[PDB]
Amino acid sequence: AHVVKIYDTCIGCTQCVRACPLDVLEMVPWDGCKAAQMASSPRTEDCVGCKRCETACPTDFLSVRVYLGNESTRSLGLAY
Amino acid sequence: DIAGLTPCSESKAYNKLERKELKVLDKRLKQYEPGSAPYLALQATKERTENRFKTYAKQGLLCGNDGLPHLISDPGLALRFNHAGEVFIPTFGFLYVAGYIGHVGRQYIILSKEDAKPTDKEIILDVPLALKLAFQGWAWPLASIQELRNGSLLEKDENITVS
Amino acid sequence: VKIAVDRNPVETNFEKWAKPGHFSRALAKGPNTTTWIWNLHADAHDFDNHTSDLEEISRKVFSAHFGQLGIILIWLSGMYFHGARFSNYEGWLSDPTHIKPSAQVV
Amino acid sequence: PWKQPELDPDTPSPIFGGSTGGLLRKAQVEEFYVITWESPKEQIFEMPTGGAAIMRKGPNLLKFARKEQCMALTTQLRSKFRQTPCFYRVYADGKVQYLHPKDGVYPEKVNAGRVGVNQNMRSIGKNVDPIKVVKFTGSEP
Amino acid sequence: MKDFTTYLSTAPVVGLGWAIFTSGLLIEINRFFPDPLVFS
Amino acid sequence: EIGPKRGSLVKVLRPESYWYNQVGKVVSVDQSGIRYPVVVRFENQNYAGVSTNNYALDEIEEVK
Numbered sequence: 001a002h003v004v005k006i007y008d009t010c011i012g013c014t015q016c017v018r019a020c021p022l023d024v025l026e027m028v029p030w031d032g033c034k035a036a037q038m039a040s041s042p043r044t045e046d047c048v049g050c051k052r053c054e055t056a057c058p059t060d061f062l063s064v065r066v067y068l069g070n071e072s073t074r075s076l077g078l079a080y
Numbered sequence: 081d082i083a084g085l086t087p088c089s090e091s092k093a094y095n096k097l098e099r100k101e102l103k104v105l106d107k108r109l110k111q112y113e114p115g116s117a118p119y120l121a122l123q124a125t126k127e128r129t130e131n132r133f134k135t136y137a138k139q140g141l142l143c144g145n146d147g148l149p150h151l152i153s154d155p156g157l158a159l160r161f162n163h164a165g166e167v168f169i170p171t172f173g174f175l176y177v178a179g180y181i182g183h184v185g186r187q188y189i190i191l192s193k194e195d196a197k198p199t200d201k202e203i204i205l206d207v208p209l210a211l212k213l214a215f216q217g218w219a220w221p222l223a224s225i226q227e228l229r230n231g232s233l234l235e236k237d238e239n240i241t242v243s
Numbered sequence: 244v245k246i247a248v249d250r251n252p253v254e255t256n257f258e259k260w261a262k263p264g265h266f267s268r269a270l271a272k273g274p275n276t277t278t279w280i281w282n283l284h285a286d287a288h289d290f291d292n293h294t295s296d297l298e299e300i301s302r303k304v305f306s307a308h309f310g311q312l313g314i315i316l317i318w319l320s321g322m323y324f325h326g327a328r329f330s331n332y333e334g335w336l337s338d339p340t341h342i343k344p345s346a347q348v349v
Numbered sequence: 350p351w352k353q354p355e356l357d358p359d360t361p362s363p364i365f366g367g368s369t370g371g372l373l374r375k376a377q378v379e380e381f382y383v384i385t386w387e388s389p390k391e392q393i394f395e396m397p398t399g400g401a402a403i404m405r406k407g408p409n410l411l412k413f414a415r416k417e418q419c420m421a422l423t424t425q426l427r428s429k430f431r432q433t434p435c436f437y438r439v440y441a442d443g444k445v446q447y448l449h450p451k452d453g454v455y456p457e458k459v460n461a462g463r464v465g466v467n468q469n470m471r472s473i474g475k476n477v478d479p480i481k482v483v484k485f486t487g488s489e490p
Numbered sequence: 491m492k493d494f495t496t497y498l499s500t501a502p503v504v505g506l507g508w509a510i511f512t513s514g515l516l517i518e519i520n521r522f523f524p525d526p527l528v529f530s
Numbered sequence: 531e532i533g534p535k536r537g538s539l540v541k542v543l544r545p546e547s548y549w550y551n552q553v554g555k556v557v558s559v560d561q562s563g564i565r566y567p568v569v570v571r572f573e574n575q576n577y578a579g580v581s582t583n584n585y586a587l588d589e590i591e592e593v594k
């Protein structure tokens with residue numbers, strides 16, 4: 001039940017998508033960049049809060065932010 | 081005198097502390113022979129101890145009821161009652177040395193940054209340049225006020241802020 | 244089973260003494276932060292991370308172990324020497340119970 | 350993809366003696382995940398929970414309790430052996446859901462069908478202070 | 491030799507020479523002139 | 531030409547940036563209508579280790 005918002009400064013590196021283990025992020029076409037790509041966060045219900053996505057964004061300041069919030073079974077990474 | 085402190089010459093506990101510290105060595109000196117090296121070592125320590133006590137008394141120090149010398153910090157009382165060498169004068173002896181270190185390091189930083197690859201110059205120093213600046217810093221207060229009155233000391237809002 | 248040796252693999256010179264961080268690919272670039280300094284002294288003796296070759300890791304290890312022996316032997320010789328010139332061994336030998344050892348005069 | 354592949358719950362599993370990192374009571378009650386892939390030969394691979402196992406030529410199937418345990422295995426197979434796995438989500442009610450290649454193409458490659466979600470059209474920062482939204486939830490949305 | 495002098499110009503080697511200077515200077519200034527506290 | 535010249539130094543004005551009120555070389559500029567075309571390169575690294583970032587026209591100004 002975490003929140004993931006991507007901002008206007010994305011450049012279509014795809015490094016955020018490759019890093020997330022839980023497949024929260026995917027690439028969508030867009031007209032704002034040279035690469036003509038942008039990220040997205042359709043399924044944040046599966047988000048866990050590892051912040052590997054933030055680690056990979058090479059911008060001056062991040063085009064991706066994970067705002068932590070209410071927890072859940074999927075978010076807490078509980079096998080039980 | 082001042083602050084209810086006696087001079088160290090007139091104090092009794094000051095001389096009591098001298099007779100004590102010498103008695104320890106005399107007892108320790110009895111064990112060894114006259115012409116041996118342990119005897120010469122202790123006699124020298126005895127000679128130094130006798131010199132430490134008389135020199136502190138000669139210097140117009142102030143000893144308290146415990147018998148130990150006290151220092152005075154206000155330059156007014158220090159100059160009025162002749163206790164300036166204690167604190168007031170060494171204050172200027174340090175600041176001359178401390179500013180020496182700043183004026184030197186500040187110049188090495190500025191000059192290496194005017195060239196290519198200044199990062200290498202920090203881990204691998206230019207020793208000829210460092211010695212040159214280190215022997216040119218005898219008159220750092222002149223250069224500081226020269227650089228302040230000129231305005232090339234401080235930077236002007238070309239620095240990073242956070243908000 | 245037999246002996247096997249490779250002749251003159253490495254040249255001996257102070258060229259790499261001037262270039263710290265040569266062992267690692269990341270550190271050979273140079274410092275832009277002070278973190279490069281801590282990583283230098285840390286990753287220095289992690290030979291497994293420098294290179295994948297098991298042979299080079301073996302050459303480095305077998306030769307570094309010779310260093311610890313030399314470091315030990317001057318330490319051990321120091322105790323014998325400091326015990327010879329700056330000690331009371333001959334006096335303690337004649338009256339061991341009452342006399343105490345000493346080898347570090349100040 | 351062209352069409353979602355439905356689950357074949359009866360396929361051969363790898364040769365694995367067993368371990369203690371398997372499924373717990375949560376799986377039967379809440380949900381569990383299963384992964385499928387197709388190998389060309391018999392190989393050995395590291396399991397996320399436990400040790401090593403031997404794949405089988407043809408389809409293979411595993412059961413896991415977490416999505417990360419499954420995607421951890423996809424990254425191993427896509428890199429080491431260069432395969433194309435696909436995994437689902439199974440609830441206690443028997444319902445099945447097809448998750449990861451939801452469009453058939455992996456997420457790191459674009460596709461025209463996808464639609465953006467949670468896309469702010471502003472720079473990071475450049476957003477209202479919390480005082481403006483003091484009595485309801487959210488400064489970023 | 492150019493590389494040897496460069497190694498000697500590194501930070502810790504230059505710091506070692508500094509330390510022997512400042513330390514030996516202070517010690518010998520306390521070997522002679524023993525026990526200063528007041529400056530004349 | 532839309533923007534600053536190639537190889538020209540410019541000063542940044544993003545408040546968020548590690549390089550704010552700091553100078554960097556212009557690596558390139560795109561003239562296809564992108565929101566953040568101006569590519570800039572600095573010598574000093576940021577906290578992550580990146581020394582480049584695409585800035586906008588309004589966010590950059592002349593040196594010093």
Ligand code: CLA
Pocket residue numbers: 263264266283284285287288303307310311314503
């Ligand atoms: C048991 C101690 C020991 C031993 C055997 C080694 C062995 C080694 N270290 Mg290591 N190291 C040690 C302790 C030790 N280290 C410690 C405590 C640190 C600090 C964290 C380091 C930090 C370190 C770094 C950062 C690096 C090494 C490197 C090396 C290799 C370099 C060998 C070389 O150039 O020949 C040395 C040759 C000699 C002849 C030895 C004597 C040289 C003397 C000291 C003359 C120079 C002194 C100079 C004139 C100034 C002082 C004079 C006087 C006061 C002594 C080798 C595997 C380097 C490497 O490439 O490893 C992969 C490297 O980059 N080490």
Ligand code: CLA
Pocket residue numbers: 185189201202203205207210211214277280501502504505507508510511
């Ligand atoms: C993680 C923390 C960290 C670390 C590891 C460092 C590390 C370093 N900093 Mg640094 N710094 C830090 C945090 C840190 N800093 C912070 C938080 C700040 C505040 C912003 C600074 C601000 C700062 C400044 C402003 C400077 C450094 C400098 C340095 C370098 C010092 C090298 C040195 O002392 O020269 C070697 C040691 C000496 C004592 C030099 C002495 C030279 C004398 C004159 C030679 C004379 C002796 C002679 C040659 C030998 C004769 C011997 C004979 C008798 C036998 C070193 C790389 C300095 C630099 O750039 O390097 C030069 C510098 O100017 N730092």
Ligand code: CLA
Pocket residue numbers: 304305308309310312
């Ligand atoms: C009788 C033969 C013999 C002897 C005495 C040794 C002795 C030793 N070997 Mg060894 N070794 C041998 C055969 C031998 N080896 C064979 C046949 C192989 C290959 C199969 C190896 C491969 C081997 C490796 C890979 C390593 C050793 C190491 C060591 C040392 C361990 C350090 C220790 O425990 O402190 C005891 C220390 C001492 C007793 C100090 C004495 C030191 C002197 C110089 C050694 C003298 C013996 C020497 C081997 C004789 C031949 C040298 C001659 C050709 C010049 C020790 C000196 C380690 C090493 O090199 O550490 C430095 C190490 O890593 N050995």
Ligand code: CLA
Pocket residue numbers: 202203260263280284500501502503504505506509
């Ligand atoms: C032999 C083992 C050994 C040891 C103990 C050290 C220890 C150190 N190295 Mg190092 N180094 C080694 C081997 C070793 N190195 C080898 C083999 C190499 C490859 C040539 C290097 C290359 C290297 C580089 C390139 C640098 C160091 C630096 C440093 C210092 C870290 C900076 C710090 O904390 O001060 C922080 C200091 C300040 C913030 C202000 C300056 C004040 C300092 C402390 C005064 C000088 C200290 C003096 C060197 C101490 C005497 C030496 C001591 C080990 C006995 C630290 C003293 C860094 C440094 O600047 O050293 C000073 C640095 O940039 N090392």
Ligand SMILES: CC1=C(/C=C/C(C)=C/C=C/C(C)=C/C=C/C=C(C)/C=C/C=C(C)/C=C/C2=C(C)CCCC2(C)C)C(C)(C)CCC1
Pocket residue numbers: 153154155167168171179182183186224
């Ligand atoms: C005298 C005395 C005293 C008094 C004091 C006082 C009280 C004072 C005050 C003072 C103050 C109130 C002041 C403040 C201000 C400060 C400042 C402002 C400083 C300056 C600095 C600077 C600016 C810098 C420096 C430098 C460096 C860092 C490096 C480069 C160069 C130089 C060196 C310059 C007492 C009694 C205590 C003690 C004794 C003596």
Ligand SMILES: CC1=C(/C=C/C(C)=C/C=C/C(C)=C/C=C/C=C(C)/C=C/C=C(C)/C=C/C2=C(C)CCCC2(C)C)C(C)(C)CCC1
Pocket residue numbers: 135166167170173523524525526527528529530
């Ligand atoms: C011995 C002798 C002598 C002399 C010598 C000399 C060389 C002199 C001295 C020297 C000097 C020159 C000294 C100095 C001293 C110093 C001092 C005395 C210091 C102290 C310190 C202080 C003052 C501190 C304070 C403080 C505090 C407490 C807190 C706050 C901070 C401060 C830091 C400020 C002669 C010749 C007669 C000879 C015989 C013997």
Ligand code: SF4
Pocket residue numbers: 006009010011012013014015016017039056057058059062063064
């Ligand atoms: S990591 Fe950030 S900059 Fe890179 S493609 Fe994803 S959103 Fe854009």
Ligand code: SF4
Pocket residue numbers: 004019020021022023024025046047048049050051052053054066
């Ligand atoms: S924190 Fe982890 S799971 Fe959540 S969006 Fe970032 S990379 Fe994906």
